[PDB]
């Protein structure tokens, strides 16, 4: 039996370029977590106290996703690299443009998976492009909640009567077309 | 005992007008079903998640509508003829405007039911009478449903807040009057 | 961000000829779900009432299939394209006819899904495969229920009293092999 | 306050030839009643159990529509008249025969409640027009059932082991298309 890059015995080598991609993909979702948690802030600053909540649970929920990963290469016995976090961005003019970064993260978060999934096919992973196949439907999924919660934001067309109807659906959990 | 038309036992022989307006009121129900489906998708690319709920919900209940009619002919004896149905509409400037559609397709759904209707009158079919009697009983409360929604709507003058508010209310199921 | 043809928040751009081709397997679906609604009342029609209701909740979920590929056209911010529908047949000389029908069909949906899942390959649209992968199973679910209801009705090899017993199966929910 | 012809408080005059038709109509239900009577006893000498007792509940059901009539006769302050019954008929070489017999005498009930009805209606007695309706419908229902029997039984084609499967059905209840 063979040791993996991390110590543990090693079912299949996995490709260096294959393995740094998914090191970096993990930064990528620490960085969406830290993101949320500075949209959590602004919106907590402007008592937008629903979507202060709502974007305090996604921020916990990346960092799920984030911790998942390493668990895959865990279970690979390929090693973890940690990388420096960037700073978030936490200014913005209003919540229609808070919402359209928000939006775009989660569609650069798949982007992401996807270049980690044409890699693994590359590479015929097929360990890999299994274990990301689920993490792509959730993507799906974010990305059609997040365009309803910019475009219902939009909707509002920047009137504080609709934001505050809208921060009350966040705050009792009605996030989704549903 | 004769046999009718579908091969079954036949109890009363049907005028072919009627089954003919039988066979033809059932692509109506169909074609409503079909349009608020249209509908139920127009509203989900606006963020409203309400009315996608409700329409979708209303495409559900006219196909129930259409397969009710299916099993009368059934029970009379005489052959279905389901038809080609024609492509909904789905395009509206406007949730206003997409709510008048509605209503008219209800009143016009109504109306040829009254057709029907006045069909088994002049042939005194008896059976056909009684077995649309609790239909225009439905037709006039939906009727006083969608007069209601239409109407909820138009109060809003087109105000975004307002329209977020009665979207609340039909994700609700606060549709009628009550 | 930019918007996609439907005019929500796009998160990923779609091939046009991958667009079409989701479009006309909402229609496949749509025409399997009038289909099974025809062979219901086919059925009815000769007083096999286990069949009929198996036929009429099929219907009813070929429907809820072809909706769940108009949810997927909403979150990838595509534009729907509800297109007119055909007549299904109406007519078989036989139950073991009508099931072949009902398992080719079946078959020819999932070579549908399978031509879409080609396309969005070639496109290497992931998003598009892995919401197809468990359409997929789930017709290899189907497919399997089909051959071993139409296997068992040619099994009866046209003798009533089989077709009977096979009928209270059906009106019992034993409809797979289990 | 004028008396009836039974005596009562009389809201409304009825027609002579309207009075005696109802009465007819209620000698009509007291004879089905009897005639399944008759039937039920047929299969019970033959050891059909099920149909035995199938037809013993609708001897006791058409009894108790014939009791709904006279009920409506002393609503209507008007008379009853309880006529002979003539004997049923007790023979038939086989159960199709006696299952044809059945639904022939469920569609000359319904005929016999419309030559009512046509004559309220020439009188615009809408009392009772409203009165037959719901009885219209379940005759409609009836109508249908038996025609679902009777082409059952058809269906087997004189095999005994088809026809205790059916009997089998019918002594669990299971006596609709459902
Ligand atoms: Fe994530
Ligand atoms: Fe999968
Ligand atoms: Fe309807
Ligand atoms: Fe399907
Ligand atoms: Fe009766």
Redesign the interface.
Known sequence: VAQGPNGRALAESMNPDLLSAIQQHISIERYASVTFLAMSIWCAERELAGFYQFFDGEAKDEQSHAVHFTQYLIARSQSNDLQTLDAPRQNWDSLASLM?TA??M??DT??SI?SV??LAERNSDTRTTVFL?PL??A???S??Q???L???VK???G?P??LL??DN?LRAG?T???
């Open positions: 359209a939006f775009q989660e569609a798949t982007s996807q999934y044409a196949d792509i439907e993507q799906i999924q990305e059609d997040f365009a309803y910019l475009g219902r909707f509002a067309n009137d009567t609709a109807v809208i659906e009605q989704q077309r549903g």
